[PDB]
């Protein structure tokens, strides 16, 4: 008896034409999140150019039934708010709370918060007409909470276990910024300020994501000294037992309410500046409470993706991810993600190849200490930082990935790729070959 995680089927949809420009303006590493399943429906958000004709860029939201059968994508366009900042840093983050309300935050680079929410719980009480008037107008504050809401970059949403939704983001800028958390009550529709949880000391933290399991909130970050990406140093870790009010390091030592970038009690690996480690890559809490970080560095003597593992007993390991035919990325190459199956035995590396203009779905196993990376699938013709649907992977065993293609405008499309997983038990029965 042995078990193998397998891809039963592979399908794709082209959900739009990518926006014109030199910069990547869809499918970017720090989007949290872009593709979300809530009950029977999958939701996606991305920027599209206005159909008439080229100046205006709008937030677009798709939904499709994914249960109990997969239906067609349909779209609404939020054509009341044109995007002021179409540079590298302004991508959409989307979240869905336990009252079925859909939250959007977008169009940020050191500007005041941009936020909007559905009038109603449209993911719980599902409307049949999918139109832009489902969403309230854009606001620059969080009702019931307090700023500072400026200068804001990188809205990240994290659904908690009780229907509530965290919103996290940087205030200040590159090489001088603080990180704040706000909590939405699904129960009241009010935000409360959890305040500054990381204080920059003439630098800023860049978090890899927010992960939640059994009452515990996990995060990991590097520290950036200046606006130049070469000036990232350190891989840090902390977790909260009260959804981001109170924080503890890997040794379970409680921390000062604002964590300082200067305090190395949170440091879990020494990575100096100019190690070619990029900010805002990937992390994961697997369903067995093991914590993962995806970064990269050239420290081994080669540029390679690095897997940091925090084994449940507080002990850390670092192991390069070098499966056959994966080109190791440099500082400015597309950033990847880690996903986990419901069982918690199978770890997926969703790793864009820096040369091949494709994204690899690699799998490793807890049994073999996550050192057994196998190529399981490949998304071809991508120039993207892959983003996936953690809810749909957990509750349907389907790995659903938002990608931006490689190539020029207008050939370059936005797509969703669905890899139907099949965990196979193998019985090998010895049988008679005798006369
Ligand atoms: C590596 C780079 O980091 C973030 O963008 C930075 C960027 O380094 C630079 O223009 C300046 O530092 O502004 C940005 C900032 O204030 O954060 C983003 O993660 C980019 O996608 C990434 O390329
Ligand atoms: C605290 O954590 C670091 C790893 O982050 C480790 O090197 C050190 O041994 C730990 N110290 C204590 C007192 O547990």
Author numbering: -3 to 431
Copy the relevant paper text:
In this study, GA-specific l-rhamnose-α-1,4-d-glucuronate lyase from the fungus Fusarium oxysporum 12S (FoRham1) was cloned and characterized. The results described previously indicated that FoRham1 was an l-rhamnose-α-1,4-d-glucuronic acid lyase. The structure of FoRham1 comprises a seven-bladed β-propeller domain, and the Rha–GlcA is bound to the cleft at the center of the anterior side. The active site of FoRham1 is located on the usual anterior surface of the β-propeller fold.
Activities of His105 mutants (H105A and H105F) were also significantly reduced, highlighting its possible catalytic support function. Therefore, we used the H105F mutant to obtain the complex structure with Rha–GlcA. The Rha–GlcA complex crystals were prepared using an inactive H105F mutant (described later). The Rha–GlcA (H105F) structure forms intermolecular interactions between a crystallographic symmetry pair through the C-terminal tag region. The ligand-binding mode of the Rha–GlcA complex of the H105F mutant was similar to that of the Rha complex, although the positions of Tyr26, His85, Phe105 (His105), and Tyr150 differed slightly. The GlcA residue of Rha–GlcA adopts a distorted 1E conformation (Cremer–Pople parameter: ϕ = 249.7°, θ = 111.3°, and Q = 0.619), which is clearly different from the stable 4C1 conformation in solution. The Arg166 side chain forms bifurcated hydrogen bonds as well as charge interaction with the carboxylic group of GlcA. His85 is located near the C-5 atom of GlcA, suggesting its catalytic role as the proton acceptor (discussed later). O-1 of GlcA at subsite +1 interacts with the side chain of Ser170 and the carboxyl group of the Pro223 main chain, and the O-3 atom formed a hydrogen bond with Arg220. Therefore, this conformational distortion of GlcA at subsite +1 is caused by hydrogen bonding with these residues, notably Arg220.
